[PDB]
């Protein structure tokens, strides 16, 4: 008999139902987000970090470190091969 008032009732529930769950999921991660490679930490030195940076990095990612390890184990084992036989 009178005029009910829909057009300003969105205060109680934000428009949409499915994207409401994703709103909180995607709005919160943008605060603590790296602008462009912040704190890359590409430089380190712990007597083995240089080897990791030079060979164990994703830029090369080749089979050369495995061959170097094989050569090193051969060099180490030559001495005890002489010692045993």
């Amino acid at each position: 008999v009178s005029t009910l008032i829909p057009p300003k009732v969105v205060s109680s529930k934000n428009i949409g139902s499915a994207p409401n769950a994703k709103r909180i999921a995607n709005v919160v991660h943008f605060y603590k987000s790296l602008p462009q490679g912040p704190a890359p930490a590409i430089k380190a030195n712990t007597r083995l970090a240089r080897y990791k940076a030079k060979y164990f990095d994703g830029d090369n990612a080749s089979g050369k470190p495995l061959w170097h390890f094989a050569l090193g184990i051969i060099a180490f084992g030559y001495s005890m091969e002489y010692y045993f036989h």
């Binding site: 930490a41 990791k52 940076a53 164990f56 990095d57 994703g58 094989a70 184990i73 051969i74 084992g77």
Partner: protein, 224 residues
């Protein structure tokens, strides 16, 4: 620290370097070695789903994964000219097979108890043939107890022995002979071939071990 101890500590160091040292800062990009580890994880997890899946595959996936990586790192250090096959006794693989069979039997006797004896009679085979069936399946399980060790261990030792005998018998490759042409270089070709064969065999038999232990776990948990 004996040869086996140093070999195992080096294996542990390199295997942990392949994961914790591959990550420069543990990015979400998932680099080529990271994506290789991801592919291996996905493959082992889908062994688990395909062969033991249905209620409790995820629970038993980790031992499949760990055994796969241990066998992978053992087989990787098998072709290096100095590489010794883990003190060259290979009884370790037999011990692993025996302990895995014992664990599977314990799991069967725990989750089924006396019902585990009903596994010897899958579908039919009535009373006149029941003792024969139970004897046959018990002997098959006893053979399974030794199948896994006398398999990977046997192939690794056979590959190493072939390596040694081949290298020994071509010692005159260009020492004093006059016929050391490509005909005399053919032995080098067969040595290269057995390099490739040993590599492929090691990888495919690691896969064999994974699928066999998955099937054994399925037979233990699920009675058919």
């Amino acid at each position: 620290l004996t040869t086996f101890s140093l070999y195992t500590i080096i294996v542990l160091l390199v295997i942990t370097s392949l994961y914790t040292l591959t990550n420069n800062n543990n990015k979400i990009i998932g680099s080529r070695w990271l994506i290789s580890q991801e592919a291996i994880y996905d493959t082992i997890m889908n062994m688990t789903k395909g062969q033991i899946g249905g209620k409790n595959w995820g629970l038993y996936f980790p031992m499949i994964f760990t055994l796969f990586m241990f066998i992978f790192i053992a087989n990787l250090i098998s072709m290096i000219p100095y590489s010794f096959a883990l003190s060259a006794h290979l009884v370790f693989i037999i011990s692993l097979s025996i302990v895995i069979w014992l664990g599977n039997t314990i799991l069967g006797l725990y989750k089924h108890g006396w019902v585990f004896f009903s596994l010897f009679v899958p579908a039919g085979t009535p009373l006149p043939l029941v003792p024969l069936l139970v004897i046959i399946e018990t002997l098959s399980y006893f053979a399974r107890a030794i199948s896994l060790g006398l398999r990977l261990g046997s192939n690794i030792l056979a590959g190493h022995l072939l390596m040694v005998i081949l290298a020994g018998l071509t010692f005159n490759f260009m020492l004093i002979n006059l016929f050391t042409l490509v005909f005399g270089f053919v032995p080098l070709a067969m040595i290269l071939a057995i390099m490739m064969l040993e590599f492929a065999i090691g990888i495919i038999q690691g896969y064999v071990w994974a699928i066999l232990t998955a099937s054994y776990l399925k037979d233990a948990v699920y009675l058919h």
